[PDB]
């Protein structure tokens, strides 16, 4: 006996050693160097589209890789595939489970997945030859609700779940290629990388992790956060990433710098960050907040460049076209607002 | 022009079929009453319905469609997912009434109830209360080895409601105790002070009698109070 105690001393103390390695790296700060940067000035978006199609509150969105289409999931069990330009409905899919907490669009547009409290990953094919959109493949390996997912390809796809673990699946076999574990809570948010080498994930342990898609190992654990991590998005180039949290602060972390880059907070905001997303360059950081006002920050200068009026109820989801051509805002008002 | 005109026509029909489907969807959907049933375990949440996934229940009662849901398939970290339901007609909170022993996990029920009651997202949701294990509560209380009075001393001086309903052969402390817990949820009811939602007690395990009459009539009244409240009466 008395082994767990020394385990605690050696374990946490070592943790202190890692902390030492982290803080020694602090030779500069992004804020120090942003003095020289010309800021953005007051620049705001405007409502280019008002999308009235949903009966219930819109809980999540995703862009189609064409920067044209975008996918929306509704709490009513309807999964609607929308068209930005013609503002019509590209497809309408009845869900098996009325509760959908997320959905995503395939890189090729072949498939679209959704998920929620149903504990199952619903894969729908857009290529159905016999007819309209039908259930293509269901992936149920999860011991917890289906929180989120994003496509690596048409075959293998990452999912996150309240089972506290993340999973890399393959549709055809119906099994998981590999399963990633080691967070202490539900994995609430994820963002894949453009190069799909590795992926970040936010969870309820107030820590953002970088895993490796292929290796199956935890590469890095970053803890700067004050509270739970609601939403997280990797930087376009793959070298950095942004974090939304319940801390009521959006925070910027680097993978390669292995420590906190920057903190965005405000003295007047008691409400958490629902969702986050980038700009083309990564100079602008979009943040949706529970106050129903979306602050547009300058991911470098750190001052809010602008704000988004909009939905009268909570902002659920936020997304930017792969080419950064457009911004999309889902809320619980059943209305989608598209901005630029 | 051929592509744009041609898509206006084809996609136009797409829009017509989809939208007409939508109007067919909103009426059937919104006409139903979705309810969130949750309890720790041994809640006889499957018993009330026994007399789509296993969790979801589709039922017809008195020309009123109901959608019950069981969260029994999820882990106990709820703060993330429980926000999914702020339009749900009601949160049914089902607790075993005899759970004061083991530790008094009913005290946990109290705390969780305060939790649901306190969320900004649930401010608009009324909580229908299911006190399960009524008889088991009464008997368990008479057992005495583990005492409520440690965890609820105020029972000695907290007073019987005027409408007292003892069962045949029932020591008055048992009945008043029952309503006493109910009142214990009542001070919680006044904790908000908003008046948007309310706690309606219920009794199960007393007999197998259906809660549907309760469940319905109370739900009916609740949403009626959404209309009334939004109609500036209250």
């Amino acid at each position, epitope marked *: 006996q008395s082994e767990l105690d020394q385990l605690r001393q050696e374990a946490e103390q070592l943790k202190n050693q890692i902390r030492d390695a982290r803080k020694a790296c602090a030779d500069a700060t992004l804020s120090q160097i942003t003095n020289n940067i010309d800021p953005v000035g007051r620049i705001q978006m405007r409502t280019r589209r008002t999308l009235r199609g949903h009966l219930a509150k819109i809980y999540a969105m995703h862009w189609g890789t064409d920067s044209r289409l975008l996918v929306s999931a509704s709490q009513d069990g309807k999964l609607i595939i929308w068209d930005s330009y013609t503002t019509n409905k590209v497809h309408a899919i009845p869900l098996r489970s009325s509760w959908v907490m997320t959905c995503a669009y395939a890189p090729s547009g072949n498939y679209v997945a959704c998920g929620g409290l149903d504990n199952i990953c619903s894969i729908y094919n857009l290529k159905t030859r016999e007819g309209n959109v039908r259930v293509s493949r269901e992936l149920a390996g999860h011991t917890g609700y289906l929180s989120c997912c994003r496509f690596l390809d048409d075959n293998q796809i990452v999912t996150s779940s309240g089972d506290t673990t993340c999973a890399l699946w393959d549709i055809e076999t119906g099994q998981q290629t590999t399963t990633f574990t080691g967070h202490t809570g539900d994995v609430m948010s994820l963002s894949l990388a453009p190069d799909t080498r590795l992926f970040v994930s936010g969870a309820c342990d*107030a820590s953002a992790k970088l895993w490796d898609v292929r290796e199956g190992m935890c590469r890095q654990t970053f803890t700067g956060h004050e509270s739970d991590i609601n939403a997280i998005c990797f930087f376009p180039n793959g070298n950095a990433f942004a974090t939304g949290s319940d801390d009521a602060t959006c925070r910027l972390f680097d993978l390669r710098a292995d420590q906190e880059l920057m903190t965005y907070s405000h003295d007047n905001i008691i409400c958490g960050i629902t969702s986050v997303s980038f700009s083309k360059s990564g100079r602008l950081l979009l943040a949706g907040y529970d106050d129903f006002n979306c602050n547009v920050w300058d991911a470098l200068k750190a001052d809010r460049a602008g704000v988004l009026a909009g939905h009268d109820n909570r902002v659920s989801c936020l997304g930017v076209t792969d080419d950064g051509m457009a911004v999309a805002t889902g809320s619980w008002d059943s209305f989608l607002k598209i901005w630029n | 022009t051929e592509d744009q005109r041609n898509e206006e026509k084809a996609q136009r029909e797409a829009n017509k079929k989809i939208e007409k489907q939508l109007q067919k969807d909103k009426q059937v959907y919104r006409a139903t009453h979705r309810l969130l049933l949750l309890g720790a375990g041994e809640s006889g949440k499957s018993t009330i319905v026994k007399q789509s996934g296993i969790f979801e229940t589709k039922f017809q009662v008195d020309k009123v469609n109901f959608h019950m849901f069981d969260v029994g398939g999820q882990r106990d*970290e709820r703060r993330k997912w429980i926000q999914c339901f702020n339009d749900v007609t009601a949160i049914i909170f089902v607790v075993a009434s005899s759970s004061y022993n083991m530790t008094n996990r009913l005290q946990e029920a109290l705390n969780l109830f305060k939790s649901i009651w306190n969320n900004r997202w649930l401010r608009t949701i009324s909580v229908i209360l299911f006190l399960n294990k009524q008889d088991l509560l009464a008997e368990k209380v008479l057992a005495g080895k583990s005492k409520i009075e440690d965890y609820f001393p105020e029972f000695a001086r907290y007073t019987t409601p005027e409408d007292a309903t003892p069962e045949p052969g029932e020591d008055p402390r048992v009945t008043r105790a029952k309503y006493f817990i109910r009142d214990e949820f009542l001070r919680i009811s006044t904790a908000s002070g908003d008046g948007r939602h309310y706690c309606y007690p219920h009794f199960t395990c007393a007999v197998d009698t259906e809660n549907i009459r309760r469940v319905f009539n109370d739900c009916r009244d609740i949403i009626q109070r959404m209309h009334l409240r939004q109609y500036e009466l209250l």
Partner: nanobody
Framework: QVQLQESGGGLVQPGGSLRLSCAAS????????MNWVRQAPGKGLEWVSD????????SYTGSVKGRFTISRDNAKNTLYLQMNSLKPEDTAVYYC?????????????????????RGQGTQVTVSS
């Protein structure tokens, strides 16, 4: 990181008094509703006592009501449990946990097994 350092605990003969401390860091202790939650030997989690940021809103479990003192030092960002009326039935593993969400009323702690914000905890034992 996010950490809470529990002090105190040990063997105490019933009836004493103790000022328990919890060190907060990795977050602003001022903004979080605090509570002491115990997990009894071979028993599930149970909420024990919570305190508001201001230290005004304060609730206890029925037994510990008024007989136990939860007190927070925000300026020092540390938490306290002063024990009176100690019983061998109160002996348990005491964790000091913070409510997850900032600036709120509800809390989703006392969650069995995994819970984000919690220290290593102490053992508080009341001899017979």
């Amino acid at each position: 990181q996010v950490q809470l350092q529990e002090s105190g605990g040990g063997l105490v003969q019933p009836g004493g008094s103790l000022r328990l401390s919890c060190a907060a860091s990795g977050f602003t202790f001022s903004n979080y509703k605090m509570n002491w939650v115990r997990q009894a030997p071979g028993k599930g989690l149970e909420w024990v006592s919570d305190i508001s940021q201001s230290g005004a809103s304060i609730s206890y479990t029925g037994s510990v009501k008024g007989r136990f003192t939860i007190s927070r030092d925000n300026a020092k960002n540390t938490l306290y449990l002063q024990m009176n009326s100690l019983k061998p039935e109160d002996t348990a593993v005491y964790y000091c946990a913070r409510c997850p969400a900032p600036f709120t009323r509800d809390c989703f702690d006392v969650t069995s097994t995994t819970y984000a914000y919690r220290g290593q905890g102490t053992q508080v034992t009341v001899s017979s």
